[PDB]
Amino acid sequence: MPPSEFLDKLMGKVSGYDARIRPNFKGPPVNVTCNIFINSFGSIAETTMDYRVNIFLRQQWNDPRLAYSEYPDDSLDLDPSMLDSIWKPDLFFANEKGANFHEVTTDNKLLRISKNGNVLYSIRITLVLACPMDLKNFPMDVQTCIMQLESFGYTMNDLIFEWDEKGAVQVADGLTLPQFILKEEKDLRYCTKHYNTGKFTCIEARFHLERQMGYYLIQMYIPSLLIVILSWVSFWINMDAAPARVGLGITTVLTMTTQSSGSRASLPKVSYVKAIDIWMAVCLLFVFSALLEYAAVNFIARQKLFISRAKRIDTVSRVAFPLVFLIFNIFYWITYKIIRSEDI
Amino acid sequence: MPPSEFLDKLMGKVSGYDARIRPNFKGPPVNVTCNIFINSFGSIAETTMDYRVNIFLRQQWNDPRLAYSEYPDDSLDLDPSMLDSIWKPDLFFANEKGANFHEVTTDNKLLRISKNGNVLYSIRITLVLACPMDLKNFPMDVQTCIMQLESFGYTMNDLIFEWDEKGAVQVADGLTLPQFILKEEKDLRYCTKHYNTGKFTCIEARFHLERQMGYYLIQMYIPSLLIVILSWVSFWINMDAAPARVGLGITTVLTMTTQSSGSRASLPKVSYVKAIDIWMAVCLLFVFSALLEYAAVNFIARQKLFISRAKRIDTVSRVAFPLVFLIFNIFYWITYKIIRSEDI
Amino acid sequence: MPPSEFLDKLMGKVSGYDARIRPNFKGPPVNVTCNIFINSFGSIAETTMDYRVNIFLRQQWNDPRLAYSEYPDDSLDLDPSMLDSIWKPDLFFANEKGANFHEVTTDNKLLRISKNGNVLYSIRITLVLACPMDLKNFPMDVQTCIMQLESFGYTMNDLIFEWDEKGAVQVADGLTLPQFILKEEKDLRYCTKHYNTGKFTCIEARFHLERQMGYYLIQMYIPSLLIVILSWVSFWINMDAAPARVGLGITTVLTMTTQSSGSRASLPKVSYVKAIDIWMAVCLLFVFSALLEYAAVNFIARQKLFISRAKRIDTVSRVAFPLVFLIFNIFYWITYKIIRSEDI
Amino acid sequence: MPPSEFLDKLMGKVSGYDARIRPNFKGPPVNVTCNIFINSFGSIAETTMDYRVNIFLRQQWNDPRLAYSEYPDDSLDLDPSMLDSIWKPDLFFANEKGANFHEVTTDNKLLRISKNGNVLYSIRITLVLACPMDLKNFPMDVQTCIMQLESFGYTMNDLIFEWDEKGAVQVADGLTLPQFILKEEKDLRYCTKHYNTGKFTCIEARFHLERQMGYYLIQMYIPSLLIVILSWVSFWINMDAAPARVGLGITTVLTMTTQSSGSRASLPKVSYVKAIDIWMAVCLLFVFSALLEYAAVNFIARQKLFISRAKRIDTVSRVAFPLVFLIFNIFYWITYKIIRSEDI
Amino acid sequence: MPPSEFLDKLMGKVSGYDARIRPNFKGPPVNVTCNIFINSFGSIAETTMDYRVNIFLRQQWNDPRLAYSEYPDDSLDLDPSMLDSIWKPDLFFANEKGANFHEVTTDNKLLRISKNGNVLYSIRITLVLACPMDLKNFPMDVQTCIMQLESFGYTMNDLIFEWDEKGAVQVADGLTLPQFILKEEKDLRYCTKHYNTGKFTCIEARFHLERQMGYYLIQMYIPSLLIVILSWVSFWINMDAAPARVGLGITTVLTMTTQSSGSRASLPKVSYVKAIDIWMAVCLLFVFSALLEYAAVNFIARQKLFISRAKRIDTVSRVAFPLVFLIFNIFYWITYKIIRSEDI
Ligand SMILES: *[C@@H]1O[C@H](CO)[C@@H](O[C@@H]2O[C@H](CO)[C@@H](O)[C@H](O)[C@H]2NC(C)=O)[C@H](O)[C@H]1NC(C)=O
Ligand SMILES: *[C@@H]1O[C@H](CO)[C@@H](O[C@@H]2O[C@H](CO)[C@@H](O)[C@H](O)[C@H]2NC(C)=O)[C@H](O)[C@H]1NC(C)=O
Ligand SMILES: *[C@@H]1O[C@H](CO)[C@@H](O[C@@H]2O[C@H](CO)[C@@H](O)[C@H](O)[C@H]2NC(C)=O)[C@H](O)[C@H]1NC(C)=O
Ligand SMILES: *[C@@H]1O[C@H](CO)[C@@H](O[C@@H]2O[C@H](CO)[C@@H](O)[C@H](O)[C@H]2NC(C)=O)[C@H](O)[C@H]1NC(C)=O
Ligand SMILES: *[C@@H]1O[C@H](CO)[C@@H](O[C@@H]2O[C@H](CO)[C@@H](O)[C@H](O)[C@H]2NC(C)=O)[C@H](O)[C@H]1NC(C)=O
Ligand SMILES: CCCCCc1cc(O)c2c(c1)OC(C)(C)[C@@H]1CCC(C)=C[C@@H]21
Ligand SMILES: CCCCCc1cc(O)c2c(c1)OC(C)(C)[C@@H]1CCC(C)=C[C@@H]21
Ligand SMILES: CCCCCc1cc(O)c2c(c1)OC(C)(C)[C@@H]1CCC(C)=C[C@@H]21
Ligand SMILES: CCCCCc1cc(O)c2c(c1)OC(C)(C)[C@@H]1CCC(C)=C[C@@H]21
Ligand SMILES: CCCCCc1cc(O)c2c(c1)OC(C)(C)[C@@H]1CCC(C)=C[C@@H]21
């Protein structure tokens, strides 16, 4: 007979199936297997603190009833329009800004009922998940994107869902994300929302993102360093050349001020301090201190002992400033590597 | 018997329940308990003057009728699709740009009816609430976000709602807001909209936000200060070096003009004066005044008394300018601390 | 009897009410009283030329029929879902980019029917109204926002609507608009759209906005002025200092070019000239002319008469340039004040 | 009798009107008169290549049937909700990114049926039309916006539509567009989409836009010119002043590099060359060539014949560079005026 | 008889057509011909990694049943509203961010049934397709846009679709894309999604985009080159002019730092290195090295042999630096041309 009408027979008014009643009512909890496939991952935004994913949610659960066992066909495909008839678990996302279904040509929803009573339900969804992130160490940060599936109004005694045994989370290859790189650990855990009403089920899949330092290393870090090196040539310039040294020193100060001012527009718009800010502030200190010594030495030589003292101060700061800059660099880089390692 | 049909019996045409009639009609006012849980708080925008929240609205009210008292089950869960049947209070938000419900998989709406007649109604909502804010003192400002729930068309004699006794407003931990920090006071009050028709009920929960000065202190405030210090070295430079002093002074003026020009792009786009604007204007004054004195002293020495007078002017402005800058700094910081303390 | 069913009796098929037929058909025009309350005003955008408002539209009109006169209740509240039953005037907005209703929890629509037959209809709407604006004088401009309500397909003989006698337009206090200030005149007028088909009714409420000059005065106007003052110190610098004067003059030219280049990013993106553009162009002229004279005087003194002539040219331009700048400033400010006064 | 029911009689099941069948089936083509009124024109975006319009589409066509000829009323107004009943021509827009109807209070749709059988159908629509545009000559470009109405699935033998005889396209006064100016020619033409299936009807109204050169002339063009003039003063400066000339020349090069760098942010983000780019490149050449000659002359005089040769080179390039710049300016402006004239 | 009712006869309950059953059930696979017409291509966004297209999807398939063969008309046009009746293949797009239908006036859907049983189905769709792209070589990159059509839930034994024999993909002329140029190869291939359930059909059309180097060549590449040339004039400047050389060298360093800082705002916001970044870093090296040699030579001459050695170093670096810059340029350009050729 026509396959669709057989389904009508199964879920129709004649037979006592009420879509509003959980399978195994007043009984053992319904177990739901969950499989997630990520088509596209991207659009991470630091300001609004959300990223966008397109996924293929796949729930598997067993229904005691709705087992026909008298048909040649081994499975039945329900029409996507009349999806109200089957009881579907109310699975939502705890950290959801907004999500909607797809209607490109037909509903991207597939439901298949096996002979024994297994139900396979697949839904293609696009989601704006909200993940808290921080930029304490902005060039070298490892953010974690948390995706959590939780029930709405059903307790542990009623509905339980957990991850599939193998291949629970899969990702289509070649994401080519603009800033971060998606790692392949994809660790899975459990959450149990303990509320006043009772325990609620939750499962959680998190993803690790590691930010690439290509543009960050080549721009900002390398030019600042070079400008500090060019700041130190004033030491090697003879003391008598007052216009040449004053002009060079102030111009280098202007140069770094322009570099920082230009780079902040590219940088994220946050209010707490970051690592790049510390680096820029330290470079401003180095250029500023190098100008100050020139004005601290020229005063000394106009008022032959003073000449000797001035040249001594020149040579001392000549070998002092690179070595102190090296000590700063070693400590700064070591500290950030240790802190990122601690994070991971 | 099947739980759903029992509900049908209760709210069906057979029994006289009209969803359009308030419980306790022509009687004492219906009291509605209100609980709010904030999943996510963020996306504060100074231009459009709105912020976005995702909440879990939870209304509790007592209905005299709809009390079954003849069933084993202690509570009944109504289907979210057929929510028209129950009478729901028309609670809206007075300051709403836009809001919509969630349909991730199923309706994020739960309604539960107790044995006695208590109704528990939970709705997950995302809201764009509008809060007036001001930036009279932009780096150190404390804005208040006002969330107010008001009735639509029901008077105090008909419908009254107030906050829950304990845990009325709850916030999920780890917001990690980009600029502000959410405080934990969360004070609650009442409003009564007195109109021509009559008094209308309203309850109001406000949140205090304190802006972090990390990036604001490290960038702009610290470099400007350093550039003013480098402006004062021209005093210590000998008078005879006309190219060195003129070049240094104008270059410092250029340097601050570039810093202010770069920083305004990062700053908010408002038309009234702020605190950072006062600081930048004052620094421009300091660099400008320091150039002016050099051109006021060089004229004096070309026309031995004049030489003495010139060197006197040099030494006087040498000890004058830092001390006056210190007096300005003390007054500026003290005034802003007092005004922010007054605000809080 | 139940209040709702009484309404059913009134507007049901049994009685001859056809919602598609105007009250007083083939008769005197229906008069509609209109009241507007502005919850929020903001999001003025110069590029797309639209602003966003949230309002409380309140239409009052009298219906000859639908007068019950046999009930204890003095008014009847119709269910918002079944609003098709009553005849509602088709009032639209002539300058509408986009508008939509609110569904925060329930429909924000209230309709109340009095005993005599008065109908009170209240709708909360958010609107993107389009108002033409211009920036001929950008820092000192007074734009007018025009809100106009017009009928759609009904002539003057059929439907007429006008403003309420008192309190026709009300605004909630504390808008805190980022750039403009909303004035309180709120003048009301009439329009009659004379078309080929006939006269159509329209009423119009306009709002006056005055742009604050805080940030505009403190930034751009004040630094440019100071840079022009620093440009004139080259006159007081001795002629013999060729590196000092050439360096100072070109550096000041660079300084203003940087200020204008930075400020244009903040400024609106329009193609016609404004006032700030005239001010920046004039300042560029002043710096350019001051460099030109230095190169016009140095040539004169290398080829003792020439020395005297050169020093004469120096002193003449020394007292010339400030006074001419003052004459420009007086004319520019006076002209803009007169033109803005003419506008208002 | 009630006017609405008369319409029911006309289009009801009793009478044989099938809304799915074209008027004059198996007969002469239906002729549709088309009238367009533009409420608002704006939001031209060069990146996405689309502009937004709000229009009043007005189709007039004659229906042989649906002529009552037995009623006092001379016209009948159909309810906007039940618009499925009448047969409406399937007119779409060939170059449409997105469009939607308006629901401000009621449907902005009016349909009126005359006594003889003329049908007047008016729809208010907002449209995002896509028009290809180019910026070969960006400051002086004349873009054309093409609006084309075409049938969907109906051939010339079935459905033909053309423009109204007089006042086919009308525009509400005072657009105040930010960059372009809308011209009043508004020329109308025909298109016939010849496909594999057959000829399809189309009518096309295009609009001419002329870009204002106010801000473009005052900023960028005028300062660059002035900086080139200030570059040439180095020629008049004496050869012996090596710091003054080298400093001035390089500073002018820096000045133009800053102006171009600042202005590109304001300019459109396209990849092909424009006119402003040619102007900036040419100015960079002029400043660069003027620095090169100074370094080409100073070498000559250190190695009395060489002194004479150097001063000769100075005077020659002194009168050479302005005149060559003038020749460039004349050719550049003449070429752009000719090309824009060719376009129009 | 009326054409529509004949269709009703064909697909009505009386005849056994169940829209939920595939044509040729339990039989040979249904073959679907696919034709795509691109109205508009644009809005390529590097950040979110998606582009927007407006297309005319045209599916052709043969249905054994639904062949009337007793009517004068050679084809039947089904009403777009009642499209549920016919069985439509569930064709979706594998890489879809979001897509929706058009409702400008009527549904942009046409279905025509031939006499034999061929079904022609045309749908106008706007799509946000997601294509991975990379910017390893940003000025000279060739990205590929992949459009793939795949079935949802139907295996190869059930449903197969492939491209039309001729004119499978067509593009309307005159795209005028802002950055890329669309090529005309438009190569077609197959994909077969091998899953756990079975093989699924897919067809794939890709488009080649070549980025124009107009603005990229004229701006950034040409000025940097010129600034490096102006950096080398310091070699030709005499050694004794310490203020002139130091001032020129540092000013050129400042000039390039400003150019790079300004240009990054225009450039895409990605984290990995690009080609333009390498070019800017190399130019910073050239200016930095040229300053370093001046400070490496001046030290040598203050401590007649040293004078000779200094002048030797000057001449050596004078002929060294251009030639090394030439070697770099040749290698850089050759490498990028080879890599782009490899890509294509
Ligand atoms: C879902 O899985 C849970 C896992 O705990 C099952 O619960 C256990 O079932 C076994 C088998 O009957 C019992 O031995 C345990 O006592 C159960 N534990 C609890 C805590 O109930 C549950 O049976 C599964 N659901 C179904 C429908 O089989
Ligand atoms: C809702 O709470 C209000 C609080 O005022 C209750 O009103 C009071 O009820 C008590 C108990 O009967 C009376 O003694 C007071 O006279 C009431 N005050 C007023 C102003 O009416 C009200 O009864 C509560 N609602 C319900 C349904 O119990
Ligand atoms: C709506 O107001 C108009 C105002 O013009 C009323 O029209 C006038 O009504 C008075 C009172 O009967 C007459 O004396 C005038 O001749 C009317 N003027 C016109 C131009 O018709 C109108 O009656 C009001 N509508 C209703 C329903 O009362
Ligand atoms: C629509 O206009 C067309 C214009 O071509 C009309 O077609 C012509 O009608 C006249 C009058 O009967 C004939 O003399 C011509 O032979 C027709 N030309 C063609 C090409 O058919 C058409 O009749 C008009 N439609 C209606 C319904 O009158
Ligand atoms: C769709 O095309 C496929 C192409 O493979 C057809 O399948 C072949 O049909 C021919 C003709 O009967 C047979 O000789 C082959 O054995 C078939 N191959 C396979 C793999 O089945 C198929 O018949 C076409 N569909 C229809 C409805 O004709
Ligand atoms: C090595 C034995 C005596 C050293 C005296 C000495 C000299 C000196 O010039 C400085 C010293 C210490 O400390 C540091 C921290 C390096 C300073 C950096 C800031 C500036 C302005 C000066 C530096
Ligand atoms: C202390 C006894 C006499 C002081 C004379 C004196 C000298 C002086 O140079 C100034 C004085 C006062 O006032 C202040 C406000 C500090 C001025 C700041 C602005 C400039 C251009 C000059 C400053
Ligand atoms: C007062 C009696 C004779 C005055 C001669 C005189 C001298 C002079 O230097 C100028 C004069 C007029 O006109 C103005 C408009 C002020 C000019 C501004 C532009 C420049 C380059 C030069 C200015
Ligand atoms: C007029 C008789 C001989 C002229 C010799 C001559 C000299 C000269 O300096 C130049 C000449 C031609 O050609 C132009 C194109 C103007 C050049 C512009 C670029 C630079 C660096 C030099 C210019
Ligand atoms: C040709 C025979 C001996 C050459 C000695 C020599 C001299 C010299 O100045 C340089 C040399 C090599 O290597 C290159 C890579 C060109 C250097 C570029 C970086 C700087 C600071 C110096 C350059």
Beta carbons of B239 and B314 less than 8 angstroms apart: yes
- As for ligand 10, residues whose beta carbon falls within 6 Å of it are E 289, 292-293, 317, 320, 324
Beta carbons of C104 and C120 less than 8 angstroms apart: no
Rg from Cα positions in chain B: 33
| Ramachandran angles phi, psi of C36, nearest 5° | -125, 130
- Give Cβ neighbours of residue E340 (< 8 Å, ≥ 6 apart): E137, E140, E141, E142
How many CA atoms does the CB half-sphere of C129 hold within 13 Å? 23
Q: Say how far apart CA D177 and CA D180 lie, in whole Å.
A: 6
A298 is in an annotated binding site: no
**Token pair belonging to D84:** 């499925």
Ligand 1 touching residue A117 (CB < 6 A): no
Q: Do E238 and D242 touch (CB under 8 A)?
A: yes
Ligand 7 atom showing the smallest separation from residue B321 Cα: 16
Q: Where are the alpha helices (DSSP H) in chain A?
A: 3-11, 214-216, 222-231, 233-236, 242-266, 275-302, 305-343
Beta carbons of B34 and B58 less than 8 angstroms apart: yes
Ligand 6 atom showing the smallest separation from residue A292 Cα: 21
Q: How far is the CA of D317 from the centre of ligand 9 (A)?
A: 7
Beta bridge partners of B118: B62
Which amino acid makes up residue E156?
Answer: M
Beta carbons of D111 and D123 less than 8 angstroms apart: no
Which amino acid makes up residue C127?
Answer: L
Given a contact as 3+ CB pairs under 8 Å, which chains touch A? B, E
C15 is in an annotated binding site: no
Give the resolution to one decimal, in Å: 3.1
A124 is in an annotated binding site: no
Q: Say how far apart CA B72 and CA C147 lie, in whole Å.
A: 60
Q: Which residues from D are below 8 Å from C295, CB to CB?
A: 233, 236-237
Q: Do A258 and B263 touch (CB under 8 A)?
A: no
Q: Do A98 and B103 touch (CB under 8 A)?
A: no
Q: How far is the CA of D174 from the centre of ligand 9 (A)?
A: 52
CA nearest A182: which of A128, A130, A136, A144?
Answer: A144
Ligand 2 touching residue B28 (CB < 6 A): yes
What's chain E's length in residues? 344
How would you class B197 by CB atoms within 10 Å of its CB: exposed for 0-12, middle for 13-18, buried for 19 or more? exposed
> Which of B34, B194, B272 to mutate to test binding with chain C, by most C CBs within 10 Å of its CB?
B272
Q: Say how far apart CA D315 and CA C65 lie, in whole Å.
A: 99
Solved how? cryo-EM
- Taking 3-state DSSP, the helix, strand and coil percentages for chain A, each rounded to the nearest 5, stand at 35, 30, 35
Kindly identify the ligand whose nearest atom is closest to the C-alpha of B61: 2
Ligand 3 touching residue C28 (CB < 6 A): yes
CA nearest B317: which of B241, B237, B244, B246?
Answer: B237
How would you class E217 by CB atoms within 10 Å of its CB: exposed for 0-12, middle for 13-18, buried for 19 or more? middle
Beta bridge partners of D107: D103
**What are the angstrom distances between the C-alpha of C127 and each of A1, B53, B147, C57, C95?**
56, 22, 22, 11, 10
Beta carbons of E47 and A43 less than 8 angstroms apart: yes
Residue E322, Cβ neighbours under 10 Å: how many? 13
Beta bridge partners of B30: B159
DSSP letter at A27?
S
Beta bridge partners of D201: D192
**Token pair belonging to E184:** 């005309």
Q: Say how far apart CA A156 and CA A198 lie, in whole Å.
A: 8
CA B234 to chain centre: 45
Q: How far is the CA of D320 from the centre of ligand 9 (A)?
A: 7
C298 to chain D: closest CA residue: D237
CA E323 to chain centre: 38
Sign of the torsion formed by the C-alpha atoms of A119, A125, A128 and A132: positive
Distance in Å from the first CA to the final CA of chain B? 60
Q: Say how far apart CA A299 and CA A308 lie, in whole Å.
A: 13
Ligand 6 touching residue A292 (CB < 6 A): yes
Q: Which residues from E are below 8 Å from A180, CB to CB?
A: 271
Ligand 3 touching residue C31 (CB < 6 A): yes
Residue B227, Cβ neighbours under 10 Å: how many? 23
> Which of C5, C104, C182, C315 to mutate to test binding with chain B, by most B CBs within 10 Å of its CB?
C104
CA nearest C89: which of D76, D8, D114, D104?
Answer: D104
Chain B nearest C-alpha distance from A267 (Å): 10
C87 to chain D: closest CA residue: D106
- Give Cβ neighbours of residue C52 (< 8 Å, ≥ 6 apart): B97, C42, C43, C126, C127, C128, C129
Ligand 5 atom showing the smallest separation from residue E24 Cα: 27
Distance in Å from the first CA to the final CA of chain E? 60
B58 is in an annotated binding site: yes
Ligand 7 touching residue B294 (CB < 6 A): no
Beta carbons of E261 and D262 less than 8 angstroms apart: no
Measured N-to-C along each axis, helices B305-343 and B275-302 cross at an angle, to the nearest 10 degrees, of 170
Q: Which residues from D are below 8 Å from C292, CB to CB?
A: 229-230, 233
- Give Cβ neighbours of residue A176 (< 8 Å, ≥ 6 apart): E49, E132, E133, E134
Given a contact as 3+ CB pairs under 8 Å, which chains touch D? C, E
**Token pair belonging to D155:** 């051939």
Torsion on CA atoms C123, C124, C126, C127, rounded to nearest 10: 30
Given a contact as 3+ CB pairs under 8 Å, which chains touch B? A, C
* Three-state helix/strand/coil letters over chain D: CCHHHHHHHHHCCCCCCCCCCCCCCCCCCEEEEEEEEEEEEEEEECCCCEEEEEEEEEEEEECCCCCCCCCCCCEEEECCCCCCCCCCCCEEECCEEEEEECECCCECEEEEEECCCEEEEEEEEEEEEECCCCCCCCCCCEEEEEEEEEEEEEECCCEEEEECCCCCEEECCCCCCCCEEECCCCCEEEEEEECCCCEEEEEEEEEEEEECCHHHHHHHHHHHHHHHHHHCHHHHCCCCCHHHHHHHHHHHHHHHHHHHHHHHHHCCCCCCCCHHHHHHHHHHHHHHHHHHHHHHHHHHHHCCHHHHHHHHHHHHHHHHHHHHHHHHHHHHHHHHHHHHHHHC
A87 to chain B: closest CA residue: B106
Beta carbons of C285 and B284 less than 8 angstroms apart: no
The residue whose CA has the least distance to atom 11 of ligand 6 is A320
The residue whose CA has the least distance to atom 5 of ligand 7 is B316
Beta bridge partners of D130: D50
Q: Say how far apart CA B192 and CA B163 lie, in whole Å.
A: 14
- Taking 3-state DSSP, the helix, strand and coil percentages for chain B, each rounded to the nearest 5, stand at 35, 30, 35
Q: How far is the CA of E159 from the centre of ligand 5 (A)?
A: 12
Q: Say how far apart CA A44 and CA A130 lie, in whole Å.
A: 10
Beta carbons of A178 and E133 less than 8 angstroms apart: no
Chain D nearest C-alpha distance from E44 (Å): 9
Q: Which residues from E are below 8 Å from A226, CB to CB?
A: 284, 288
Q: Do A92 and B81 touch (CB under 8 A)?
A: no
Q: How would you classify residue A174: left for phi > 0, otherwise alpha for psi between -120 and 50, otherwise beta?
A: left
Q: Say how far apart CA C321 and CA D167 lie, in whole Å.
A: 58
Given a contact as 3+ CB pairs under 8 Å, which chains touch E? A, D
Structure-token match 């690592």, residue found? A275
User: Which of D40, D222, D237 comes nearest C298 by C-beta?
Assistant: D237
User: Which of B222, B229, B266 comes nearest A265 by C-beta?
Assistant: B266
Cα angle A98-A103-A108, degrees, rounded to a multiple of 5: 90
* Three-state helix/strand/coil letters over chain C: CCHHHHHHHHHCCCCCCCCCCCCCCCCCCEEEEEEEEEEEEEEEECCCCEEEEEEEEEEEEECCCCCCCCCCCCEEEECCCCCCCCCCCCEEECCEEEEEECECCCECEEEEEECCCEEEEEEEEEEEEECCCCCCCCCCCEEEEEEEEEEEEEECCCEEEEECCCCCEEECCCCCCCCEEECCCCCEEEEEEECCCCEEEEEEEEEEEEECCHHHHHHHHHHHHHHHHHHCHHHHCCCCCHHHHHHHHHHHHHHHHHHHHHHHHHCCCCCCCCHHHHHHHHHHHHHHHHHHHHHHHHHHHHCCHHHHHHHHHHHHHHHHHHHHHHHHHHHHHHHHHHHHHHHC
Q: Do D250 and E254 touch (CB under 8 A)?
A: no
Q: How far is the CA of A31 from the centre of ligand 1 (A)?
A: 9
3-state SS assignment for residue A133 = coil
**Token pair belonging to E43:** 């809005």
| Ramachandran angles phi, psi of D81, nearest 5° | -65, -45
Beta carbons of C21 and C14 less than 8 angstroms apart: no
Beta carbons of C234 and C245 less than 8 angstroms apart: yes
DSSP string, A140-166: S-EEEEEEEEEEEEEETTTEEEEE-SS
3-state SS assignment for residue E316 = helix
**Token pair belonging to B211:** 């802006």
Q: Say how far apart CA D317 and CA E286 lie, in whole Å.
A: 30
Chain B nearest C-alpha distance from A297 (Å): 10
Ligand 5 touching residue E28 (CB < 6 A): yes
Strands A169-171 and A159-163: unpaired
**Token pair belonging to D342:** 């060719």
Which amino acid makes up residue B98?
Answer: G
Q: Which residues from D are below 8 Å from C32, CB to CB?
A: none
Q: Which residues from A are below 8 Å from E123, CB to CB?
A: 105
Ligand 3 touching residue C157 (CB < 6 A): no
A214 to chain E: closest CA residue: E272
Q: How far is the CA of A22 from the centre of ligand 1 (A)?
A: 16
B39 to chain A: closest CA residue: A95
Q: Say how far apart CA B170 and CA B35 lie, in whole Å.
A: 8
B43 is in an annotated binding site: no
Beta bridge partners of A340: none
Beta carbons of A131 and A85 less than 8 angstroms apart: no
